[PDB]
């Protein structure tokens, strides 16, 4: 677990926790009828724009994780050809 790998796993967990909280907050608001009455339509407009900004971040991280696991396989394949044939 080098720095590059560690910063990603950490930066990836904080966005994961945000997204988790934001969704649950929204689902609960839209869950019951009486619950929606306790928030204005412009609160949704916020929540929506907040969850999306997070989603975009999460999607970016998952994409970069895909890139890392890809070089891992390539290096791993490189070494194998060197020492195993």
């Amino acid at each position: 677990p080098a720095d590059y790998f560690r910063i990603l796993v950490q930066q990836f967990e904080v966005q994961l926790q945000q997204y988790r909280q934001q969704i649950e907050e929204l689902e609960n608001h839209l869950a019951t009828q009486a619950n929606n009455s306790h928030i204005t339509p412009q609160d949704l407009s916020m929540a929506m724009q907040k969850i999306y900004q997070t989603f975009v971040a999460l999607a970016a991280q998952l994409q970069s994780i895909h890139e890392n696991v890809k070089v891992l396989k390539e290096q791993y394949l490189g070494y194998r050809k060197m020492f195993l044939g």
Partner: protein, 38 residues
């Protein structure tokens, strides 16, 4: 890469702005908040 419908997203925006809130209700929520926080 991630596919998400943009037309649907801005459509959600419109519906949110179009819909208006009753001022009398808007104030009841504010009061409730202040109290619920203090």
């Amino acid at each position: 890469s991630y596919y998400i419908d943009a037309d649907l997203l801005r459509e959600i925006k419109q519906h949110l702005k179009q819909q208006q809130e009753g001022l009398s209700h808007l104030i009841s929520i504010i009061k409730d908040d202040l109290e619920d926080i203090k």
